[PDB]
């Protein structure tokens, strides 16, 4: 490909101010231009976007500004000869930190204290409530950029770490790596189970009633992956019945999470609005990927994070 | 020194259920007895207590179950020939985790999300709000058990770490160690300033209006030491004026914090009720210290954590 222009779809506004991103790419060597909803594309065009538009199939290359590309019609890009790349590789620090934050919140009871802060109440925990992450077990399901960001911070905090990935291959700081057919073994003894997989045919509904049964009654589920990896109604039922203790949830089967979801109301559920990867430098972090792939295109190298 | 008995002052209940502590000490090899507020003491008596009682001055040895002994008349113990020990050395993991939790809460905006959760509101942060601890600077004031617990976790999360202590001597994971006369130099460029000193003559009112002026306007104060290390009214004024961004506060000039304190109402203040060191295993942690010193007393060895 010969790229002559980078179009910035308005949908990037869902994660970052489009003008900040445009400005980050001012010395890219092609012009970088805001594109509205009904923009048309053609030869020489690269497009950066949150989601898919059929108009993009006229372009040479679409870069999805998310790691997750499950909302893109991948087979159609192949057909059209349009390259598609994603933003995997940039969310390890942000998500890793958020997840460390969730686990420390539960161990140290920070969320209960925040609730009491609204009441101006000096409410002391029950003696058995506060604990330390040091010496506790975490199972990280998915061991890529997100999962490793979680693993490394968990290990540094003194946690025991196991995990699950497709290949079963070793991962630094993970004591035992399981394949997905051994999910129950992986999750059974864990104080925290963290979900960091893409949404695929295989992962959809992976965590359901039987998994909540297997999990320790004192355990918490963390979902920073995609909502439908979990059977959300089963999660509610598990929380109600005490099959698990709680959950930190950044992603949901329907987003925004509807007001009537029971999930909002559990004391030991943390709801976050799909922001575990949020950062005031997202524009720069995505721009780096674009610059990298422009240089790879320019020199005939294989594209980074090429989906199809 | 012949220790014939260990009295467990009822005040230990302020930190842990006394029966759990008593049972933890069943192996001690002297009798272990509960002591009410009017008990009298004599030769061969050891006392485990939260607070001071003049009655203890007839005992041989008092073990304070807290790290902070600022509420004990140390000069009086010396005159009376009563040994005083404290519980420093056991709070590094708990407080270190809590402080990591505070910092991650602020970086990842978890407290704001929790507030929104009460209202079933899917409220996205402002773009500029979320950040990462990785690459940010923390200044830890006090580099003992608490300070090192903080330092080690901050460094492992990728923070730049400087600090302040009395002696100026090197501390692992602290890039620059300042003496207390260089406090302003130490705090000026820090995103987080953590207080982990005892309450002493020198530390009382250490952090006041001029320190808040010096601090970055985007910085947060963390106090896990003692309330009076900070001039609390100056903290309120600094928060109101935007001289600093916020604070995580576990300790206060008056505890419980009065309901009418302005500190409750700042979005970017976390109030916790003197629980940064709370743990369901505190009884075991303190019992270990008692066991160690019982032995050391019996054998004429130097006591652990001897104050006077
Ligand atoms: N804001 C957010 O909440 C946020 C942000 C970024 C990403 N995400 C989500 O997180 C997903 C992962 O992102 P990433 O950048 O970490 O992707 P990545 O680096 O490609 O890693 C994906 C990991 O998932 C593993 N995996 C795939 N199928 C699996 C299965 N059936 N069971 C267990 N593990 C499986 C892969 O295994 P192998 O390594 O063996 O192939 C790999 O370790 C994205 O697709 C997106 O949905 C969410
Ligand atoms: N629940 C809670 O919030 C909680 C729990 C435990 C303790 N605490 C409080 O935290 C305090 C510290 O406990 P710890 O176990 O860490 O004590 P520690 O191990 O004795 O350490 C005290 C540290 O403070 C330093 N220090 C003393 N005066 C100072 C000054 N003027 N400026 C800067 N640094 C100074 C000392 O310096 P040198 O090492 O150079 O002498 C030492 O590094 C306790 O006294 C207590 O008040 C609070
Ligand atoms: Mg409660
Ligand atoms: Mg622990
Ligand atoms: Mg892969
Ligand atoms: Mg392995
Ligand atoms: Mg690695
Ligand atoms: Mg279960
Ligand atoms: Mg089962
Ligand atoms: Mg509600
Ligand atoms: Mg950062
Ligand atoms: Mg010392
Ligand atoms: Mg010296
Ligand atoms: Mg060390
Ligand atoms: Mg070192
Ligand atoms: Mg002074
Ligand atoms: Mg002075
Ligand atoms: Mg001063
Ligand atoms: Mg200032
Ligand atoms: Mg502000
Ligand atoms: Mg209020
Ligand atoms: Mg608010
Ligand atoms: Mg000596």
Author numbering:
A (entry chain B), B (entry chain A): 1 to 308
The paper states:
Interestingly, the structures of the D2HDH complexes determined in this study have shown that, dependent upon the crystallisation conditions used, the 2-ketoacid substrate can be trapped in the crystal structure in two different orientations, representing a catalytic or abortive mode of binding. In both the productive and abortive modes of substrate binding the 2-ketohexanoic acid alkyl side chain occupies a similar position in the active site, but is twisted as a result of a 120° rotation to the C2-C3 torsion angle.
Here we describe the molecular basis of the reaction mechanism and dual NADH/NADPH-specificity of D2HDH, a 2-hydroxyacid dehydrogenase from the extreme halophile Haloferax mediterranei, an organism whose proteins have to remain active in high intracellular concentrations of KCl. Sequence analysis has identified D2HDH as a member of the DDH clade of the D-isomer specific 2-hydroxyacid dehydrogenase enzyme family (2HADH), which has potential applications in the synthesis of chiral fine chemicals including alcohols, and hydroxy or amino acids from ketones or ketoacids. Structural studies have shown that all members of this family share a common fold based on two domains, which cycle between open and closed conformational states that serve to close the inter-domain cleft, bringing the substrates together during catalysis. The D2HDH dimer has an overall ellipsoidal appearance in which each monomer is folded into two domains (d1; residues 1–92 and 283–308 and d2; residues 93–282).
